[PDB]
Amino acid sequence: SRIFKIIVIGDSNVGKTCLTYRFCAGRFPDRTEATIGVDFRERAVDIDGERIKIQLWDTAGLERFRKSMVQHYYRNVHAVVFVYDMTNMASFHSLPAWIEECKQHLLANDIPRILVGNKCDLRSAIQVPTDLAQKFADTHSMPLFETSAKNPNDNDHVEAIFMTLAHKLKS
């Protein structure tokens, strides 16, 4: 059973833990706290008949709780998922910093990188326009996915996202 490592990078309080828990546990977490270091969640899936273990790494977003773990993140990493909060423009402006962190730790441009905006269910408080995030996603050659861990009503359900990423990884 081949295992694929997918790390989830992003600012603090953007919803990394809720997205990974949504994919692995199949349900929205009723209570979460600040992730310390990493938080490992695994899920077995059947892609094209082959049984694959997807290994999501819920990285930390607080600098004091991740400063020592960065190179453990980017070792034998197979896919990278950047996350921003659609109701927080400041978390979007921090994406160049995270992409710098990724490029400095990786010399190979063969691995899939995707950009994900969370909390789209809060339609009244969305701050990042879809066109701006798309224009940025296109600049760094990444696909954009606007979704919600809690209620993505007709808006790019989370499992479809990670299944797409794993499906691309199997090829």
Partner: protein, 50 residues
């Protein structure tokens, strides 16, 4: 105003003492945080073997 002057001094003394206690508490913070990182790092290395 001489009563204000010594009153100030006592607050300064208590302030310094408070700094000392905050230093120890911050030390204990680093004690705890680093220990969490050690546990998480080992778990990462075990998982990086596969």
């Amino acid at each position: 105003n001489q009563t204000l002057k010594d009153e100030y001094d006592a607050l300064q003394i208590t302030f310094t003492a408070l700094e000392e206690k905050l230093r120890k508490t911050t030390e204990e913070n680093q004690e705890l945080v680093t220990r969490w990182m050690a546990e998480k790092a080992q778990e990462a290395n075990r998982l990086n073997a596969e």
